[PDB]
Amino acid sequence: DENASAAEQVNKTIIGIDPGSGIMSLTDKAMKDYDLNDWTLISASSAAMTATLKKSYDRKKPIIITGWTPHWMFSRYKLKYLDDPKQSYGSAEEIHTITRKGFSKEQPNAAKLLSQFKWTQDEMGEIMIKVEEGEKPAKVAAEYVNKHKDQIAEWTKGVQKVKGDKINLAYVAWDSEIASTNVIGKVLEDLGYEVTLTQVEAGPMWTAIATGSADASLSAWLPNTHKAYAAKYKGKYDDIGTSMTGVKMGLVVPQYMKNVNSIEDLKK
């Protein structure tokens, strides 16, 4: 149709990720806030969303996805966030490092390391790009700790080596969190820790931390994205670090969709 709206072009459909993720919750809210209730949000997964993104992009087809930043797709593709004047996705979002309760006094050495873990979107991007191109996260992390010596010394500042202390990192298989988890896991490994990486859904990751079935996680997006999880387990986890600031999430489109610039444009 020559005069097709944005809505018409994508058939009132948004391509999402795993249904337990916060971005999906926030998108459910956005759709109510912007009176997009006749729209369909497709639950899927990180990998299905990016495969779908690839197919549409290479054909220059209209598509709207649940996107976030830090993510390699912004490097691979020319994408933009739809303006969110209602701030349905919130503001001032960060990635946090959380532990099971008591961990800081229980394992103060590892807690100090975890509290001092910080890095940038481009630094995480280094790992994520190499992982999507086919390298194993463990090997890419090993490259990173060797390449970035001065940073790793910052993280380990006043942190000591140990003799086999067990530690269990819960994580969710988002591209960003696979990168942060493996890089910190390697640093712990280099420090002498016996490291287990426990992959879980969103929901289960919070539950693991809140019950102490896992020790720590780098997968907390706060305060907006995992608002509901944090509220559910309010007194039952410690927030010991902020590994990244200025992170974002929302509805994302290719830049070739020139006339679609705000979530308000989807009302049409």
Q: DSSP string covering 59-112, please?
A: TT----EEEEES-THHHHS-EEEPB-TT-TT-SSEEEEEEEETTHHHHSHHHHH
Question: 237-254 and 79-81: which strand pairing?
Answer: antiparallel
| Contact partners, residue 27, CB within 8 Å, separation at least 6 | 14, 16, 41, 66, 251
- Do 109 and 231 lie in one domain? The reply is yes
Say if CB 255 and CB 57 are below 8 A apart.
no
- Do 220 and 176 lie in one domain? The reply is yes
- Do 107 and 230 lie in one domain? The reply is yes
Closest CA to 172 of 9, 19, 8: 19
- Do 103 and 160 lie in one domain? The reply is yes
- Do 69 and 168 lie in one domain? The reply is no
Domain that holds residue 189: 91-247
| Contact partners, residue 16, CB within 8 Å, separation at least 6 | 23, 24, 27, 41, 42, 43, 44, 49, 65, 66
Q: Is 151 helix (H, G, I), strand (E, B) or coil?
A: helix
Q: Compute and round to an integer the Cα radius of gyration of the chain.
A: 19
As a whole number of angstroms, the distance between CA 25 and CA 31 comes to: 10
The CATH number of the domain holding residue 259 is 3.40.190.100
Q: What is the count of structural domains for the chain? A: 2
Say if CB 191 and CB 221 are below 8 A apart.
no
Resolution (A): 2.0
As a whole number of angstroms, the distance between CA 257 and CA 260 comes to: 6
Say if CB 167 and CB 194 are below 8 A apart.
yes
- Do 219 and 97 lie in one domain? The reply is yes
- Do 41 and 96 lie in one domain? The reply is no
Instruction: Dump the DSSP string for 163-218.
Output: SS-EEEEEE---HHHHHHHHHHHHHHHHHT-EEEEEE--TTHHHHHHHHTSSSEEE
Query: Residue 83 has which token pair?
Result: 């303006």
Say if CB 170 and CB 208 are below 8 A apart.
yes
- Do 242 and 255 lie in one domain? The reply is no
- Do 75 and 160 lie in one domain? The reply is no
Bridge partners (DSSP) of residue 65 are: 15, 252
